[model samples]
Target: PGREILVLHVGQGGNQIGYNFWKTICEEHNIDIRSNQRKSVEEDKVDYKSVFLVEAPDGFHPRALFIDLEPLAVEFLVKEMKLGSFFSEDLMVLSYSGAHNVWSIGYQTGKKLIPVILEKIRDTMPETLQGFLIIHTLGGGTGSGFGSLLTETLKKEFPGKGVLNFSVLPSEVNDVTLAPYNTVLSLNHLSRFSDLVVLFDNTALIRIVKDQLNYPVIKQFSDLNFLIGRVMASITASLRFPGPLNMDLMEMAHNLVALPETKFIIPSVAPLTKEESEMSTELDLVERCFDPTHYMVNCSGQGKTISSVLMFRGNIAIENAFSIMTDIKSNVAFAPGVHPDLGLKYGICESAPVDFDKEVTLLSNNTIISEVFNRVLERFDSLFNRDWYTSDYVNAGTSKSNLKEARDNFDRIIKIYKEIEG
Candidate 1:
């Protein structure tokens, strides 16, 4: 029996989680209760199916949506569960499902997914279907990039029928240069499309797994699934009729815990000095950052505050720092966690001016990584002239006077990033 609901995976990151691994996991869980048995279909790539396709429109509302774009994320979700049972014939699943997704790539897929999503919603609504919710992750490439796009599209499609979006984020990776960019992109998408973003940092999740199962990161899927399942179950169980639960914020929290690197860096009490008196007292900074690779001394003053203050003295790429800074500017919830002071300060340093063309020249011809890096570098160059000390709209004052403005400004920047990426 077809229920006519649509469950779009949005990107290939989920596919990378390993289709075969999921199939076995699903079977073990006894999820294949439907009449249609799970079967593998070989087309452009090998894909498994235990659900039906809905006759939905090719495009949905607001054009599209983009979520997690990282391919490495697939390594975790690899066919480990019964997706077929989770989404009954009641829903139609349309996705690139298995593809390398980034901003541009996710947008391309959105061009395809939006229409399909619309068609499915139109064909099912006012008949057998009740409503739909958009599920996605936001930690890496596809989830962060395309997941938001998908949520926006869903909101556009069914305004009256509630729409819900979820995201899974990674903990802070201090040594890696990609955190800033990811933060910017992720927060932007979260502010715009997600009603409730539950973030679970990788570091927090890893710690929980280590404490419970006593296993390494690679062997922590059981704990990961437990977390994922618990969240999903909580949402489904708590729904009141067809209204949205606004899981976007909660999902963002989930991503924060999922990251393996997130460590509490801020201490309960900061040592005050005679010179640092300008810090605000209303704000509370999380000096204990989740990053394991980077060393951060928790410093809270009584006047001003800063987040992601990168005083790059070594050879650092401005483009990367710009992207990271942009992300810092975009995050609202993260600002308070950086320092105890109400005022937030995000500092970045340009260690060295990067030559984009020269960096690529060193790589061999037709290297995709080199090309992508070059493009990202160009983006950094475009953002170089932005004001470092002041925000785009918000005026400078104490954190108490600026807390509301800080949250608002943070939300606005995230919206901008989502628009650019989607």
Candidate 2:
């Protein structure tokens, strides 16, 4: 069966991250942006179909959807796409009006375009499909509200395909005042519908960019998005390159997700800073991923790790990998009944990007994420209690009962993780 993944870039943040991710992987795969053709003979062994569909005359078209409630985001993407035209315009699906920062409006409007979006999704469906990959921020109207609806809809339509979401959590000082509400509302849906969710907190991500990471220029959203792209490229490198000890998406999901509600993944990456220009051994790269500052999401030390998968790329020492795992298993804590070694697996890609000699990405399930949820609820309750922006949601087409249910569902989500962690 073909292991093809269709990516859905669901909002402004989603589109930006998607652009970064595609560019990074495209470089790794040796694809010429202008021609949409393979630039390097070295990539003959690479499986481009994992994220693309081959066109008869045009070479490869990305198996992706660029979606938004407002046209501006998609328009900007189109402008950039004009530079290379690597993807098809047919993949862009959008609504006319903005979501107006209200979850209700976003969902309701997104619902109107569901049929069309589904059709667009099906147009490039691989003969043997793997799953869906969604990227979005959970603080905004379009990303949170429409993201929830889109996640649920994909699950309903394609019951068998796995949906993996890269969800960006809202920062403490958010641009949207109703961010907590949007975040809390989307939690239950994403938790249920996605087979795996990789969380990135904006607060932690911005800190990583501003303080820890190295980049070509001044700090901007592009740097953060590029970092995500590198992490994602590392995550998918084994699949693309077909290396020894390569792990597919489903295999990693099964290894890490212990339960239905325990599928949220905390991704960490190491050695992206200028100070780390010094060479690191295979073990150092592996160990550094466990460091707290490298973590994409902060768990507040509230939970135990149920499982972990390490993805290694560039100048990796295959000889030392197993010994490294054996040495580290004794040090890291695991939840009851889950042996550290048994709960661990890894994949290595011999190919490395030019910027670094070694790169490591950690995908782990830790129950401490509940503490993050706890804070979201705290912020959500204070606003809901004050009836702040409650009327806007109702006026947009959802009921008060739905909002209550969203809160209740999110609280239960927090409880599920808390119980697992404890």
Candidate 3:
């Protein structure tokens, strides 16, 4: 009856991902969305409390909060019945004046949410609170700033509970030139408060959606959201299903967080496209997860990893994992200083997603992940050099000096990875 993790879906990226996640999780759980009841006559195969709460007479509610600085995102998710009504209305916390791609505005609105945040959070997570999952966007205003606020607040209010973040990074090649500004400011709080941060790069996700997923050429953000949800769902399926070598947030944190300062995680998942059925064997699916094209972010996978957890769905044999472990070591070298076995963990869970018979997800604390941070720095430096939109942040109440501090904060983050790699 405990170990519940509260979820906060902040801003557009967060809400949309949450939308896809709920749809998929519901399907996997076999819970009637209309009734929010377990459809299966089998034993409670899940810890249940981790995701489902049983307070409202309306139905079984997800232990989640949907927060967006603007209205339409949550509005659309609430009205969309393609999945029907599993979420309750009271948990939504939103504001009309949008963050508008500025960290300060989003932060200020987040401060305004301070009162609503705790009360609404209180309404869900009682003393049984295990941790927090903040699924947000690093590329946008509200998700970056407001998500950091929620992280800081949860850390303060529930110091014992973990604050895990799922941050979708903005693509640098496009209009989100302002994305890094928000990322810079918000990253400082993430550095201090969040326990673990799992990142997905927008451009890399697009690469998967376009080249791998076989979506129509004319695609929407919804298509991208679907890919992420599938990955996240695969990564998290162990928690909800009976499995050997299961992992929870704290267990994951214990394994992945080799150093507290380095909390960013890189995730790669496979079998994204329907054509992936052409795979030869279980190890083939396992091997493909290490390939760069399958990664949710664009980066080379050559760097030595500090640690990694491979969660496979569809009952991957524990015996087969011996050679799979050896295969993993040969492809992605672990840190020289750390014992390979000590830093590596893998779990097998029941059943895969509706679309596939088997799925593999790799969460790595690797030197290669720094490539993502390097790109953020590249995007940030290019714009900040010209003082591109410094006035906007200053006008929003952030100081020019503070902006540089944020940059310095991020620069050092990259260096730590480089140092580890060397």
Give the per-residue Cα lDDT of candidate 3 at 324: 68
How well does model 3 score by local distance difference test? Answer: 0.77
Whole-model Cα lDDT per candidate?
Answer: 0.32, 0.78, 0.77
Measured by TM-score, how close is model 3 to the native structure? 0.93
Which segments of candidate 2 are over 4 A away from where they belong? 40-50, 53-55, 80-84, 215-219, 273-278, 299-303
Q: Per-prediction TM-score, please?
A: 0.42, 0.93, 0.93
Clashes per candidate, residues 3 or more apart or on different chains:
130, 1, 0
User: In model 1, where do residues sit more than 4 Å from their true spots?
Assistant: 1-7, 12-101, 125-132, 174-179, 213-223, 238-422
State the lDDT of candidate 3 residue by residue for 189-278, as single tens digits: 798889998888877888887887666773556778887777667777777777776777788778888877778887888777545744
Worst 10 residues of 1 by lDDT: 358-367
Query: What's the distance in Å from true for residue 409, model 3?
Result: 1.4
Q: Over 4 Å off in model 3, which ranges?
A: 39-50, 53-56, 81-84, 273-280, 340-342
- Per-residue lDDT tens digits of candidate 1, residues 1-422? 32223334444433332232233333322333232233232321221111223222431111112223333333234334433333333333444343232333454445555665567557545443333434444434455445656666666666643344434443434222332333345445455554433333445445544543455555544544443333332222212112112222123223222221121112111111112212312111122121221111111121112222112211224455344443333442332333433222222222111111110000000111122223333333333334222231122121322323323444444333323222
Q: Looking at model 3, which ten-residue stretch has the lowest summed lDDT?
A: 43-52
- For model 1, what is the error of residue 289's alpha carbon versus the real structure, in angstroms, after optimal superposition? 20
